[PDB]
Amino acid sequence: NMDVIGERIKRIKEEHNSTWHYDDENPYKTWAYHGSYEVKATGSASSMINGVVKLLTKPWDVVPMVTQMAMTDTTPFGQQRVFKEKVDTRTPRPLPGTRKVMEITAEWLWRTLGRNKRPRLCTREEFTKKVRTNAADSAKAAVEDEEFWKLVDRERELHKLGKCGSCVYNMSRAIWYMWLGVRYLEFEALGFLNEDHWFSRENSYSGVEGEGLHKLGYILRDISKIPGGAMYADDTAGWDTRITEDDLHNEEKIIQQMDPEHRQLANAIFKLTYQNKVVKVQRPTPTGTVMDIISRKDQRGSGQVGTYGLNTFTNMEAQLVRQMEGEGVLTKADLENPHLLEKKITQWLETKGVERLKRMAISGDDCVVKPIDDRFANALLALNDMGKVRKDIPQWQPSKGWHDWQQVPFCSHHFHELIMKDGRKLVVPCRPQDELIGRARISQGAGWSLRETACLGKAYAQMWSLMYFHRRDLRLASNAICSAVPVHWVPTSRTTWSIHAHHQWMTTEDMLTVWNRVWIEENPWMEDKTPVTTWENVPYLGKREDQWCGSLIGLTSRATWAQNIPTAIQQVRSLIGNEEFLDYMPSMKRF
Ligand SMILES: O=C(O)Cc1cc(CC(=O)O)cc(-c2ccccc2)c1
Ligand SMILES: O=C(O)Cc1cc(CC(=O)O)cc(-c2ccccc2)c1
Ligand SMILES: [Zn+2]
Ligand SMILES: [Zn+2]
């Protein structure tokens, strides 16, 4: 293995030879440990509170999930405890027959995914435009510097030679250029999967990339119309740790559809950075803090460019195999068989594959499957064998499906069908309200002015206006936050990193206008394009469901908060100062 990772280690060794040592009391058991060097401690056990959001959500000061979220350990200590739990494990190798089905399926799936599209290289200008639009920190400074691009070019020349010298994953500009240069080279070779929407619903049938949270529920409702069994949504315990060498070799098959110059660069990314990796991990010691240099041949690097698309791909493949087992196409004898006949797998893929893909909604490790009947619940031999062991359930207990698409969990959410006063139906995203309020009350990082804090608060309030307007508490808090923040202040910083976020709330444009555009105008499931002229016509969940999903409506503390919210708004305003404010409270029935 040192023939592939050695050059990278040699450069880390030399760059930090002042503090380089082999700590013989390191915790790594499955990962290969190379050495350590001293560093300053990064992250805290707590997180900065958004005072604007906190001031306008007083009843949630006494809510356990809200308090819990105000913590989250990002220190070298917290990073080490989470590591040994899942990261430091080995997945048993799938059986020869299972490996054969996976290979047949992967081949078929890559050819289906590339039927209309062709792989291509992504560019310096695409990555530059991306780093610009996302920042508008030290990434934009590197992108604007020609010396960064000269180093990228040097690293690329090693890749074309089949060598790597600076592509290191993490769990000032010297190493920062080597990291951002590694991410650019990965984007150049594999970015087309994201950039050209290989996992969009139209291209992949199962995929949902580029659809958006507001479309996921409509997608789940459409799957529920397909005849078959219950809807299954099993979670895998630590998906990224369960990605085997066999999975990596099946994902690699996309290189076969590439142009020679592209194939050469993607093959270098796969073989030198996915199938062989050098990882930097922060660890505390009695002498201080160190950065450990570790390596392994399998698992997925969680923050990489290809990660989402490749997990979506491998999950679609795994779910097709489980459907095949559910249908009796694959038996126990077949999975053990090193000479299993391809014919029946190919036959099933060629005649039923696409129809079977349409029964699923897959986003990385998140899946929803509506098989042709419920034999799927007990079809576990292949799923467990492939290494995709389901979370918090005995390996062999049958899965439990849902007979109502509204009860189905997907991408940290569930979805409700709402009937508007005008009789039109909406399908909306929802989740427990404490998770929503608890996140909104946290400001990412430290050293933030009341200005930046108020704008992030406005960002969260406008996100709730567009996605979670059907929650009474969130509509009230959203109107209170927007009443307290000056009108012309542009929401800055993101509310979420979700690939399902289109950030339509990052504007000073009227939120009812934006709501109309998302839910009425551009909504393919909204046949009647009549606009909603008032927030009073934007529906709420029924009171009961609002309560079942964490609402405080009906509580005295909540009625006291609602009645006295203009006072709290006025307090934030007096602290912000002499700015122009709009009172958004009259857009509500209450005021
Ligand atoms: O990132 C977070 O803090 C929580 C979170 C999670 C998810 C689900 C997932 O991507 O895993 C989705 C969204 C989201 C919200 C509004 C619009 C679009 C997406 C937010
Ligand atoms: O049900 C509706 O359509 C109208 C509606 C709106 C609101 C939002 C607001 O807080 O002003 C709250 C409540 C509510 C119900 C029971 C107890 C406490 C509040 C009802
Ligand atoms: Zn490299
Ligand atoms: Zn709900």
From Swiss-Prot:
Residues making up the signal peptide according to the UniProt record: none
Membrane topology (UniProt): Peripheral membrane protein
Lineage top rank: taxon: Viruses
UniProt domain RdRp catalytic: residue ranges: 230-380
Positions bound to Zn(2+) 2: H414, C430, C549
Catalysed reactions, as listed in the record: a 5'-end (5'-triphosphoguanosine)-ribonucleoside in mRNA + S-adenosyl-L-methionine = a 5'-end (N(7)-methyl 5'-triphosphoguanosine)-ribonucleoside in mRNA + S-adenosyl-L-homocysteine; a 5'-end (N(7)-methyl 5'-triphosphoguanosine)-ribonucleoside in mRNA + S-adenosyl-L-methionine = a 5'-end (N(7)-methyl 5'-triphosphoguanosine)-(2'-O-methyl-ribonucleoside) in mRNA + S-adenosyl-L-homocysteine + H(+)
Positions contributing to Zn(2+) 1 binding: E155, H159, C164, C167
Topology, Cytoplasmic side: 1-591
Record localization: Host endoplasmic reticulum membrane; Host nucleus
PTM (free text): Sumoylation of RNA-directed RNA polymerase NS5 increases NS5 protein stability allowing proper viral RNA replication.
Subunit annotation: Homodimer. Interacts with host STAT2; this interaction inhibits the phosphorylation of the latter, and, when all viral proteins are present (polyprotein), targets STAT2 for degradation. Interacts with serine protease NS3.
Functional description taken from the UniProt entry: Replicates the viral (+) and (-) RNA genome, and performs the capping of genomes in the cytoplasm. Besides its role in RNA genome replication, also prevents the establishment of cellular antiviral state by blocking the interferon-alpha/beta (IFN-alpha/beta) signaling pathway. Inhibits host TYK2 and STAT2 phosphorylation, thereby preventing activation of JAK-STAT signaling pathway.
Protein name: RNA-directed RNA polymerase NS5
Source organism: Dengue virus type 3 (strain Sri Lanka/1266/2000)
Gene: pol
Included stretch of the parent chain: 2762 to 3379 of 3390
